[PDB]
């Protein structure tokens, strides 16, 4: 029932190596559905999941226009940040924005997001009350004063409570059979010697959607979090995900260890073990 829509904007200056670049990508949960790249030949908002492709020409026209205007805006923002931070016009810098809405099972806004980073560090964020700002440094305090005067929070609140939630609901219906059907992980345990006296037990989770998953090892029923190697959840390339978790076990003790999995596609938490 609970779902999210997020946009991720990246703007990069690169004096002498290219024009200032603006990229936007949009996601419903863990599924990318649109992209815009100012480096493209003739930039437009483009579909990246099939369930968005039947939106009409006015959808693509207006979201392209917003992105073209954003390209100009963020080029200016990079210049403004140079002034705030007393930086050289020859250097390369990055401005990022993430924003969007989380909806609960009732279709109501649960949480809104709107935050910015400059050169990889927090710059300014809209607080969870959707009415005040957290500025990270003295430069962002200038932006905060300007955005208070421009009533930016009130406009964001209107967008989050209206357009964002309404279009997220529409996308979830457009793509119901992929976005609202959890694909459970396919799970198995493998065994790989690290020496003549210890081996890795690796618990695999493959082919799952959405990407949130918990994967842990227990020994004799006790959590082994401190000894478990956990790789970052990674895309399989087909809009499903993969993860594994590994523990190093003494040879002959493999039966003490159990792997534990929770995922939205599993109606009960799952326990598995190594079997030769």
């Amino acid at each position: 029932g609970s779902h999210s829509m997020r946009y991720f904007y990246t703007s990069v200056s690169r004096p002498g190596r290219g024009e200032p670049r603006f990229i936007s990508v949009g996601y419903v949960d863990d599924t990318q559905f649109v992209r815009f790249d100012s480096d493209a030949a003739s930039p437009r908002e483009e579909p990246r999941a099939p369930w968005i492709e039947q939106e009409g020409p006015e959808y693509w026209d207006r979201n392209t226009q917003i992105c073209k205007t954003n390209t100009q805006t963020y080029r200016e923002n990079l210049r403004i940040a140079l002034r705030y931070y007393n930086q050289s016009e020859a250097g390369s810098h990055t401005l990022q924005r993430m924003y969007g809405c989380d909806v609960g099972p009732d279709g109501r806004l649960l949480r809104g997001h709107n935050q910015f980073a400059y050169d990889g560090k927090d710059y300014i964020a809209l607080n969870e009350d959707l009415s005040s700002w957290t500025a990270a440094d003295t430069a962002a305090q200038i932006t905060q004063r300007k955005w208070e005067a421009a009533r930016v929070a009130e406009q964001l609140r209107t967008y989050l409570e209206g357009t964002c939630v309404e279009w997220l609901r529409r996308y979830l219906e457009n793509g119901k059979e992929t976005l609202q059907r959890a694909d459970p992980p396919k799970t198995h345990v493998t065994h790989h010697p690290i020496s003549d006296h210890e081996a890795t037990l690796r618990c695999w989770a493959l082919g799952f959607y959405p990407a949130e998953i918990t994967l842990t090892w227990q020994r004799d029923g006790e959590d082994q979090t401190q000894d478990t190697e956990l790789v970052e959840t990674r895309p399989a390339g087909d809009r499903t995900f993969q993860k594994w978790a590994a523990v190093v076990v003494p040879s002959g003790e493999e039966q003490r260890y159990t792997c534990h999995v929770q995922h939205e596609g599993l109606p009960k938490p799952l326990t598995l073990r190594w079997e030769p």
């Binding site: 936007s24 917003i66 205007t69 805006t73 200016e76 705030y84 300007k146 406009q155 279009w167």
Partner: peptide, 9 residues
């Protein structure tokens, strides 16, 4: 659907 805003620092 994008927010129709052009916010400057």
């Amino acid at each position: 659907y994008h927010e129709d805003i052009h916010t400057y620092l």
